[PDB]
C-alpha cells in the first residue's frame, strides 16, 4: 500500500541513517558457519571478511555486536540487498517488537530485558534478526546476550540443530529469548516478595518509589510482550516461504510459552496493586492511632475543662455554701466523669 | 458570522504577487484594490489580518466564490486543525503557538489557508507570524519558491508552521530539563504548579498536532487537482516532521506524568506529620490548661488557700505532668 521510503527527518540530511540509542562502547562481528559434520567460529572486526558468507550452501550465523557503526550495518544491508527502511528499523532502538516479510528475507525486531537486583531498574536492548535463504544475521546493541545455549548446541552437536536449516536457527534464538523471559519473571517475583515484606514492616516513601517504578516496569513489559505474541503468531500462521513447514510446529510450542508469560504478567500487576493498597492500611493505622490519642485526651479534657468555666463565672449569687469543701466537690465530679469516660473508651477497645 | 477570538485591533491586507522574474509586495487596508489579484495567471498570496473585520472577509469570500460554511469555519477560532477539498479550492485550518519563557503559558493563534486557482488566501488573527522566511524566499530568490506554482507556496507555509512547532518543542524541552531536576531536588508548590501547567501545555500540543498530521496525510496521500502531483514528496517530508513532533510530545507527556506520579507518592506521611505535631501540642497543653482552670475557680473556704506557696507547688506539679507526657512522646517514636 506504501512504497516504504526512508524517514525524511528534520535537521538531518536526506540519506543519513542514525543509530538511535546510547551504547557505543564495543563493536565486533562473530560468525559461526555450521554443517552436518563441520563448523567454523571466529570473531573479527573487518566487515568484508564476513561478506562472502552470503552465498554459502551450509547455514551460517552472523552476529554484529555494536550497531552504532552505521557503516558496517549499511554495508551489510547493501551487500545482502536489505531495504534502507529495514536498516533504519535496525538502528532505531526506540521501537516495539515486530515482524516483517519480504520476498528475499524476513525481518524481526525483539527486545532483551535485564533486571539488576540493585537499583531496581529494567534495561532493554533491541535485537534485530534477518533470515535470508542461507544466513541468519543478528544485530545487537551491546556486549552480552542470552544465546549462549544455542552456541553450545552448535559447538557440541547437541539436539538436532546441526541437522536443519537456518529456519531452525531462527527458532532456536527466539526460543532462547522467550526462555530468558522466564528467568526475568522469576527475578521480578523475588523482588516483589522482598518489597512487599518491606511494605509490611517498613511503610516509608522509598517503598512507594520502588513500587511505582516497579509498576512502570510491568507496564513496559506488557507493552513489549503483547507484540511478541503477535510476532510469533504471525510466524507460525502466515508461514512465510523462507521458513520450512517441518519447523512450523516447533514455533507453535514456543508461542504457548509466550501465552504463559502473558498470563504470569496478568497476575503480577494485580499483586503489586494489592501491596500498594496494603501500604495505605499500614500508614493509615499509624495515623489512626495518633487520632485515638487525640480523642482519649480531648474527650477527657475539653468537656471537663468546661465545668471550670462554669465556676469561672464572675457572678455574685452563685451557690457557694457547698458541703465540706467545694473544691473537693469539683475534684470528685471530675474524677467520676474521667473514670466513666475512660471506662467507655476501654470497653470500646481504643 | 460571529468571531470567537479576542484579537479585534489589527487589519492589514498584505499581497505578495510573484512570477518567474517579477514581484510586487504591498500592504493596504482596502479590499476592492486587492480582490482582482486572482485574475492574473501569476500566483498570488493574500494575507487578511482581520477576522474580527467580518465585512472584509465576507466580501473577499464572495468575490472568490467560496461557500459561506468555510467563512463560518474561518471565523470560529476555537477549533481543531482540519482540511476539506472542494472542486474549486482547498480549505485548511491550522494553529500557531507562542510560548513565554518567563510566564510558562502557551497561547495559540488560528490560521486559515485557502488554496484557490493559482492563488492562496490566508487568515490570521494578529500581526506577528512565522512565515517571514517564505516572504524572504519570495523576495530574494533564495529558493525555488518563484519557479513553482501556488501549491509549493502552501507547502512552504505549512513547512514554516512545522518549523515553529520544532522551535516550541525545543523550548518545552529545556523547560522539562530544568523542571525535572528541580522537582527531584527541591519539590515545592511552585514545582507542582509548573508541572501541571506543563502537562496542560502538552495536552494542547498533542490535541493540535495529531489533527495536523492527519491533515498532512490527507494532503499528500490524496490526489486532488488543486495541488500538482509533483508537490507530493514535500508534503510527505512535512508529514514525517509531524511524526517527529508527535513522538517528541508523547515522550514529554510520559516524563511529566511520571513526575506527577512520583510527587503524589508521599501524601500519606505529611498527614501523619500533622497528626504528630497537633497531638503533641494538645497532649502537653490541655492537662496544663485544666490544672490552671482548677486553680482558677472562685471558691469560698477552698482547701489550697495558703499552703507553702501554692502557686509554685501547682506550677511544679503541672510541669512534672508535662515532662512526663513529653518523655512518653519521645519514648513512643514521635518527634
Amino acid at each position: 500500500m506504501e512504497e516504504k521510503r526512508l524517514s525524511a527527518k528534520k535537521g538531518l540530511p536526506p540519506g543519513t541513517l542514525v543509530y538511535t540509542g546510547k551504547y557505543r562502547e564495543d563493536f565486533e562481528i562473530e560468525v559461526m558457519n555450521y554443517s552436518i559434520e563441520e563448523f567454523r567460529e571466529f570473531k573479527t572486526t573487518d566487515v568484508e571478511s564476513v561478506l562472502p558468507f552470503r552465498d554459502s550452501s551450509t547455514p551460517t550465523w552472523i552476529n554484529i555486536t555494536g550497531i552504532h557503526r552505521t557503516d558496517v550495518v549499511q554495508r551489510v544491508g547493501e551487500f545482502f540487498g536489505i531495504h534502507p527502511l529495514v536498516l533504519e528499523d535496525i538502528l532505531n532502538v526506540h521501537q516495539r517488537p515486530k515482524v516483517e516479510f519480504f520476498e528475499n528475507y524476513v525481518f524481526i525486531v525483539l527486545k532483551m530485558f535485564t533486571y539488576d537486583k540493585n537499583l531496581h531498574e529494567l534495561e532493554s536492548e533491541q535485537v534485530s534478526l534477518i533470515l535470508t535463504k542461507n544466513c541468519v544475521l543478528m544485530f545487537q546493541e551491546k556486549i552480552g546476550d542470552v544465546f549462549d545455549p544455542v552456541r553450545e548446541r552448535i559447538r557440541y552437536n547437541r539436539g538436532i540443530i546441526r541437522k536443519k536449516r537456518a529456519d531452525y536457527l531462527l527458532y532456536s534464538l527466539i526460543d532462547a529469548l522467550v526462555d530468558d523471559y522466564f528467568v526475568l519473571l522469576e527475578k521480578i517475583d523475588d523482588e516483589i516478595d522482598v518489597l512487599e515484606e518491606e511494605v509490611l514492616e517498613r511503610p516509608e516513601k522509598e517503598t512507594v518509589q520502588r513500587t511505582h517504578q516497579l509498576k512502570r516496569n510491568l507496564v513496559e513489559l506488557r507493552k513489549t510482550i503483547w507484540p511478541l505474541r503477535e510476532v510469533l503468531s504471525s510466524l507460525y500462521r502466515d508461514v512465510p516461504p523462507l521458513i520450512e513447514k517441518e519447523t512450523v510446529p516447533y514455533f507453535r510450542d514456543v508461542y504457548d510459552h509466550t501465552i504463559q508469560i502473558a498470563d504470569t504478567v496478568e497476575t503480577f500487576r494485580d499483586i503489586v496493586s494489592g501491596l500498594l493498597d496494603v501500604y495505605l492500611s499500614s500508614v493509615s493505622n499509624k495515623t489512626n492511632e495518633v487520632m485515638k490519642v487525640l480523642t482519649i485526651i480531648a474527650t477527657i479534657f475539653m468537656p471537663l475543662t468546661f465545668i471550670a468555666g462554669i465556676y469561672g463565672m464572675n457572678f455574685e449569687y452563685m451557690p457557694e455554701l457547698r458541703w465540706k469543701w467545694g473544691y473537693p466537690v469539683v475534684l470528685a465530679v471530675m474524677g467520676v466523669i474521667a473514670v466513666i469516660m475512660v471506662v467507655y473508651f476501654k470497653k470500646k477497645k481504643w | 458570522l460571529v468571531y470567537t477570538g479576542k484579537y479585534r485591533e489589527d487589519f492589514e491586507i498584505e499581497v505578495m504577487n510573484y512570477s518567474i522574474e517579477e514581484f510586487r509586495e504591498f500592504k493596504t487596508t482596502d479590499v476592492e484594490s486587492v480582490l482582482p489579484f486572482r485574475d492574473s495567471s501569476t500566483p498570488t498570496w493574500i494575507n487578511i489580518t482581520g477576522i474580527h473585520r467580518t465585512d472584509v472577509v465576507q466580501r473577499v469570500g464572495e468575490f472568490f466564490g467560496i461557500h459561506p460554511l468555510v467563512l463560518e469555519d474561518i471565523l470560529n477560532v476555537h477549533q481543531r486543525p482540519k482540511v476539506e477539498f472542494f472542486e474549486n479550492y482547498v480549505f485548511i485550518v491550522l494553529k500557531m503557538f507562542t510560548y513565554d519563557k518567563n510566564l510558562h503559558e502557551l497561547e495559540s493563534e488560528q490560521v486559515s489557508l485557502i488554496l484557490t486557482k493559482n492563488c492562496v488566501l490566508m487568515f490570521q488573527e494578529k500581526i506577528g507570524d512565522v512565515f517571514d522566511p517564505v516572504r524572504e524566499r519570495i523576495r530574494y530568490n533564495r529558493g525555488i519558491i518563484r519557479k513553482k506554482r501556488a501549491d509549493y507556496l502552501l507547502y512552504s507555509l505549512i513547512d514554516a508552521l512545522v518549523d515553529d512547532y520544532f522551535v516550541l518543542l525545543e523550548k518545552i524541552d529545556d523547560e522539562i530539563d530544568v523542571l525535572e531536576e528541580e522537582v527531584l531536588e527541591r519539590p515545592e508548590k511552585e514545582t507542582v504548579q509548573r508541572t501541571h501547567q506543563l502537562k496542560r501545555n502538552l495536552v494542547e500540543l498533542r490535541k493540535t498536532i495529531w489533527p495536523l498530521r492527519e491533515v498532512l496525510s490527507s494532503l499528500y496521500r490524496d490526489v486532488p487537482p488543486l495541488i500538482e502531483k509533483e508537490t507530493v514528496p514535500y508534503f510527505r517530508d512535512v508529514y514525517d516532521h509531524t511524526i517527529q513532533i508527535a513522538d517528541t510530545v508523547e515522550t514529554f507527556r510520559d516524563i511529566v506524568s511520571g513526575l506527577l506520579d512520583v510527587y503524589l507518592s508521599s501524601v500519606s506521611n505529611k498527614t501523619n506529620e500533622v497528626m504528630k505535631v497537633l497531638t503533641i501540642i494538645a497532649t502537653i497543653f490541655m492537662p496544663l490548661t485544666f490544672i490552671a482552670g482548677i486553680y482558677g475557680m472562685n471558691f469560698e473556704y477552698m482547701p489550697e488557700l495558703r499552703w507553702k506557696w501554692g502557686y509554685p507547688v501547682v506550677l511544679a506539679v503541672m510541669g512534672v505532668i508535662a515532662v512526663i507526657m513529653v518523655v512518653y512522646f519521645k519514648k513512643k517514636k514521635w518527634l
Partner: antibody
Amino acid sequence: EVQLVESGGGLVQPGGSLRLSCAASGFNVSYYSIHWVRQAPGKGLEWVASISSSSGSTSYADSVKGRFTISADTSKNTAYLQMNSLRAEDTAVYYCARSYWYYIWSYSYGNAMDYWGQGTLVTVSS
Amino acid sequence: DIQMTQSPSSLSASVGDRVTITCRASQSVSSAVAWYQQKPGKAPKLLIYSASSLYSGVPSRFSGSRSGTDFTLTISSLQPEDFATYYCQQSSSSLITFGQGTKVEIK
C-alpha cells in the same frame, strides 16, 4: 586504524585561493559527516564547513558563506575545501574532523567529532 | 546563530581537586553540547557528547551536566595530563559553533 590527513596548507597572497585535501583512511567518507574547523594563532576553535558525502548537503559557516567551497570525492575518499579570496584574517591551523549523529529526542539530533586530523597551517601575508 | 559563552577563562587549580567550567547558550539548545579537550600544539580530543554521555576511552573523572541552557564540565580529581584548553560545541543546528575556551593552569 582511522586516520585523517590534511594537505595543501601554505602561504598564499591575500585575495588568493587554494584547495585543502583531507584524505581519510580506516573508514568510508560517505557514511560519516566531514567537517572543516579553524583555529587562529592564539585563539579558539571556529567551525568552517560541513559536508555529507553521500548526499552532498553542504553547510558553510556564516563568516565564509559564498567565499569557501566544500566537496567530497568517494572514488578517492577525500574531502576538499577550496578557499577563494582569502583575507589576512584566514591565517590559522585547519583541522579535518569526522562526525557521526547521536539521538536526543525524536525532534532533536546532535553530532559529535570523534577523530581529528593533525591540521595544516595556512598563512595569508605579504 | 547561537553563542556559547564559556566561564571562567583562565581557571587555575592544583592537582587533586574538583574543577567546574560553565557554558551558557545564547539560545535553547536541546542538550546537543559536546566538550573537547585540546593540549597545546595538538588536535582536540572529544570528551563529552550529548552534554552528559561519556565518550568511549575517556577517564570517568570527566563529567558533563545540563541545567536549562547551562552546561557544566566537572573534573573530579585533576591529573597532570588534564591541563589543557576545554571547548564547548553546540550541534543543535547545521551551523555549529564553539566556545571561547578555558585554559587550565597549575596553582
